[PDB]
Write a protein that binds this ligand. Sequence first.
Ligand SMILES: OC[C@H]1O[C@H](O)[C@H](O)[C@@H](O)[C@@H]1O
Ligand SMILES: OC[C@H]1O[C@H](O)[C@H](O)[C@@H](O)[C@@H]1O
Ligand SMILES: OC[C@H]1O[C@H](O)[C@H](O)[C@@H](O)[C@@H]1O
Lengths: 437, 439, 437
Amino acid sequence: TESWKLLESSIIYYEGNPIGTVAAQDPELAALNYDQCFLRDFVPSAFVFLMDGQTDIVRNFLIETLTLQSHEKEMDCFQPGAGLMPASFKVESDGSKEYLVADFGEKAIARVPPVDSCMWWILLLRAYEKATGDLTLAREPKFQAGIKLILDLCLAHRFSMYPTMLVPDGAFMIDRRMGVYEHPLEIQVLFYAALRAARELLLPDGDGEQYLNKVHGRLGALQYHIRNYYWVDLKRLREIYRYKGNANKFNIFSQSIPDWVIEWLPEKGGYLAGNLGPGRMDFRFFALGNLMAILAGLASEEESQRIMNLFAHRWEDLIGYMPVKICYPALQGLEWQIVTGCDPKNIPWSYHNGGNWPVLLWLFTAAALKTGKVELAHEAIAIAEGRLSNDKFPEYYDGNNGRLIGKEARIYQTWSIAGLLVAKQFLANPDHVEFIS
Amino acid sequence: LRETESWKLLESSIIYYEGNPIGTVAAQDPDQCFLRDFVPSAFVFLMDGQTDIVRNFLIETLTLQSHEKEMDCFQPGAGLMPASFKVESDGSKEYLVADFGEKAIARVPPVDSCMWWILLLRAYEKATGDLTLAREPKFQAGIKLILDLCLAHRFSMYPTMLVPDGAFMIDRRMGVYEHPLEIQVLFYAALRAARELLLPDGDGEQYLNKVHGRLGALQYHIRNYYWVDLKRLREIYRYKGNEFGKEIANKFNIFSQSIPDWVIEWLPEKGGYLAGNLGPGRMDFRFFALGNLMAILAGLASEEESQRIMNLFAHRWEDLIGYMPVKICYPALQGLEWQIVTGCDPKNIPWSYHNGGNWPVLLWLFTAAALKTGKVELAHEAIAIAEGRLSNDKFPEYYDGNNGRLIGKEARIYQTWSIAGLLVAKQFLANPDHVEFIS
Amino acid sequence: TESWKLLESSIIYYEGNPIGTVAAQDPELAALNYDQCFLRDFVPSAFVFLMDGQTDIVRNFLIETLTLQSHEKEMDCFQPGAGLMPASFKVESDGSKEYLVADFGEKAIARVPPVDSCMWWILLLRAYEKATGDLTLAREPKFQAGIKLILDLCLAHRFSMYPTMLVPDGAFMIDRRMGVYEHPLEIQVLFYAALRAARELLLPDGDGEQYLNKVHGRLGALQYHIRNYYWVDLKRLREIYRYKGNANKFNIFSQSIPDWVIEWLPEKGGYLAGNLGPGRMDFRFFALGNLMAILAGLASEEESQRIMNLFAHRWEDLIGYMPVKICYPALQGLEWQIVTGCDPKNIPWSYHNGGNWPVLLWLFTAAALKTGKVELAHEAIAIAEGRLSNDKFPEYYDGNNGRLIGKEARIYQTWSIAGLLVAKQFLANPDHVEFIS
Ligand SMILES: OC[C@H]1O[C@H](O)[C@H](O)[C@@H](O)[C@@H]1O
Ligand SMILES: OC[C@H]1O[C@H](O)[C@H](O)[C@@H](O)[C@@H]1O
Ligand SMILES: OC[C@H]1O[C@H](O)[C@H](O)[C@@H](O)[C@@H]1O
């Protein structure tokens, strides 16, 4: 079919071998960095290849990125943690020899750190092991060392009383300044998910035993903290609205609860908030964080049900014309200005700021399946299928309900293409959902 | 239909000049004849068969054109028609006095008045069968003088007609300057009429050549650049800014971030409309009813395009028709935009008058367009709504509010074209062949 | 000196001959259309060459543009008036042959019409005749025909009761949407100035006699209308503020007089307003319109004095760090949005919207000289000289007082360079001011 053929065209070969897929195949626009392979972008590609049985590419991807981990990465005589995985890479030729060049954030726009990338790497490594049955790769000293360098960076002692992870703005899939600084849901959910993965991956050698305990320790803390403090429902909103200023551990002034939240939430709906920090709660709903919370089992069974109840009751908002809304609602007017620095790629209901992202369909489908809401997966896929092909698989969609093709969206965006495929594969064989859960 | 209340108010409205009927007053609110206002009145009379008044009207208004008018030490184009005229008595004789814009509030020029004159002449012709009138040397000269002004050479590459703000039914500053839809549509319609009405005799062939050239360029321009639907909207939203060259998509440099949020949500999948205005760096996305409805009747819109406009009305019935047909334009300018665009004009406050008001007269255009596209149920529902209020409300000039719940703030009562509007619409409904006069 | 050498480098040769100067010599930025010769840009260049005695270039410029007038210009099967001069032109090669390509507005951004260009052409033709003493050029049938085609376009009967000229937005030096639609001062002043020029240029043959009368007729009307209706001073503001709604011929609601105007105007200051139309008066101050009104003698003697009194009392606003402010004040916030269509090149105090333009120094100097305010010319030139060279002659400056180098300004902008030169030439020999007056 059309989609498989596009996916194969996106494949990047290195020394005769396939090692990844390009971000997009848009002929008209500037190559920019979309000719590169992004670690976060490759995940849904990997899943298609894993399910198809052609696993070489995923193995090689993991081997090459592990080697990139060891590359030299710096800006102005300062090195980040050694475990840092890159945002993306591409294949360059100096005459006859081929070599890999990575962007670890020293080339990236706004110099954002690709914090979710080392998380996805660990998750994908686990996904690869479960899908193939190849235990050989994770056992090697190289990979054990690489997992450990990541954990060193994650579990490093920081100035905080909480087990969450502190990041600058634009740390995850949202790579632009969007007020997702401090402790955004996505990073915490993926952090948790990566810690869970690390348990089966870490060999319990003398050194490893030290790591597994730290992992198990943080997993517990992290789950308590996210479920008790990030969780939002009407019951919880009533509690927060009545809190005293200066029980409230984060000093939330109830006048700082938005109007829209109260009217938006159905009685049986709920979700994990976007962010938590001193004097601050981000009541914006972030899709990927919430769906992965379901998949990774971070959310409880009821909480998972309440999230899908929320998608059901607020379908136009969160799915509309193109699944899935990245976050809701959009920053608008002056708020857009202060929070994003007048970032013109993120105008209201566009891109990170309220846009609709096809790739997220694969997470929505998995999470719908895990919670038994099959009808919702059918409808979301039906919606996506009706437009994507005709629209040439746009990177994103814009507007309250995703009616517009994204303002600066690239066409033939690989994870949009891969997102649809993976969602159809899950629908055909729901047991494959185990790989991401 | 002559026994009915409306007809009686219409007969009362008639102005007489030396024992001859020449027009109708704007209102009988407890005055003078506006050229644009007379059109619906004329339509009722012609269908009923009283044509002497329409004929006399065209004669008298043609004579006024030749009158010498000036502002200060400068005189404007010879072919300019007046906004209105009235009968002032010497005491010993009756004579006609005209307002060509030199007496008008805001000193605006009535461009549409000339348009409507030509259209009414054709309307006269096609209803009576009388060809003699338009063929008279006087009328040929009159038509030509109007064409001289419309076909005035331009500095720009736009085949549209350049005008100042408030140059049509909206006679007050409303941000309708430059290239407003209504004017372009009536311009097109006036050119069409000029194809039949003009004689190739003498200088006639030279005029027909300029007319035919413009009709094509103008039709192409409006359909390709003013037309708005989701498909087209998606293209514009993805335009890159600051494109320079002969072959480029964004010829008018529209910045997508400037496109309002309401438009995206307002359009139905199967609906569409022609934009309010188009100029350098600007697109007015406001829906304008008279321009859009005339674009259907004059055949300026294609068949599909005409269907897609009526789909919009149906899908957005409360916004466009609501309590009183028909919303003059949507949406209202509000807050700081109303200030900047209208100059804090207290008569055009949000959802009032020109700025989002509902105007009875527009019902006849809506009915005509409904019939022509075969959506009769819409004309019927529209007439039903209007019929239920007007008589009781004493036929107000317009209505105010998002949906026209309020009677117009400064609306005149017993407004003639409000009355005529309803009569015309009913006459079209009874005999849909009468729609051929404006098409 | 540095400036002469830069000016010569800008010179454009055609078939071995110099025919004009490029807009800018900025190496780093995209060539765009700044590699072209703009008719409005060439004027201050021409003046330098006229004063230097090397006049060939100006003669050839006029001959070539006259030929361009006769070129085919259209968009979508519609032709503008035959007299339309182009915005700009450049030299192209098809192998060995060289040919001229013009932009008449069918290539221009936003499709703006270069209405001021045919005006400057006539003015420059007159300037050339007076400076050189060459009466040969304007007498030729070609040039008489060309002047006449322009007049046909200008004096064409339009739907208006006034003698002013109706234009779309972006018709003059301000080539972007800036609320200068309808009847902007600049067009009216230049129109007047061009009509005055046409009197000495038009041969009084049988055909010409018909033209001269129309010219003389319009000159009178136009001057009355501009002086009586556009003129602004406190006396006039008091009159307008007390006007009744619905004496007031343009229906100006006194609540639509801005606050800033009243406080801004000194007792002995005055100016010609930016625009006049139905229900509308643009109280913004536009520099070029006002200065040319002085030069062309459109303004009276006292009115000219009151304009310079205004520059003197409001020097920081209108001159500040870089002469001269193009218009004051800037459109801001929401007003910028509605009026300019969120045009990012025209953000507040930037470019057309409140920017400071070096080129305008040559008009300021001429107008200061004509009115006897020599000290003001010295100071304005002193100010300009201190920055321009070091800044590499930026196209424009930004900010309330022109502290910033213009946001997207090109460097080595020819009319910035030429502007300074012409202003120094005028200061050295004030009798040369006659050429533009
Ligand atoms: O498609 C590759 C990249 O595109 C954009 O930069 C997205 O914001 C980022 O999340 C993605 O990884
Ligand atoms: O009824 C006479 C006039 O009334 C109002 O002024 C309307 O704005 C105008 O369109 C109409 O022609
Ligand atoms: O410098 C050439 C051109 O540059 C910019 O486009 C200016 O707005 C314009 O006035 C000038 O003619």
